[PDB]
């Protein structure tokens, strides 16, 4: 068992995902948590999208990088399509990458789909790694 902590541009997308196929997939294999460089609120239609596969998110919201502690993730994923690089502790795991996937907010489901199942494939290679 090792633990997975994914950072968005605001929380509200992607890392909420990440957290839904990782917290499903990866149950007792490892353990989970979703965050963002700022702090927002859950967009409602990643819920509708994680549904679809009939995995929960909704007891997640946003919540920032500067409360959380990198030292302890064993592996930190960005996911903010482009514009950061995490300075800090946040780049010093055990792994580190970062997942330029496409923007959803106001788009359309499709799209919702279209990121959804890049964010499950990256976390279900990540955990056969590091289970």
């Known amino acids: 068992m090792k633990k997975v902590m994914f950072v968005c541009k605001r929380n509200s997308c992607r890392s909420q995902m990440a957290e839904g196929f990782a917290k499903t997939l990866g149950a007792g294999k490892i353990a989970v948590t979703s965050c963002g460089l700022e702090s927002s609120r859950v967009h409602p239609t990643a819920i509708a999208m994680m549904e679809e596969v009939g995995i929960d998110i909704s007891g997640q919201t946003s919540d920032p990088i500067e409360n959380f502690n990198a030292?302890?993730?064993?592996?930190?994923?960005?996911?903010?399509?482009?514009?950061?690089?995490?300075?800090?502790?946040?780049?010093?795991?055990?792994?580190?990458?970062?997942?330029?996937?496409?923007?959803?907010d106001g788009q359309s489901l499709e799209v919702?789909?279209?990121?959804?199942?890049?964010?499950?494939?990256?976390?279900?290679?990540?955990?056969?790694?590091?289970?």
Request: hydrophobic share 35%.
């Open 112 to 131: 919702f789909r279209t990121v959804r199942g890049q964010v499950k494939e990256r976390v279900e290679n990540l955990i056969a790694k590091i289970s």
């Open 71 to 104: 030292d302890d993730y064993d592996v930190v994923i960005s996911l903010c399509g482009c514009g950061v690089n995490l300075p800090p502790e946040w780049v010093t795991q055990e792994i580190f990458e970062d997942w330029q996937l496409e923007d959803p």
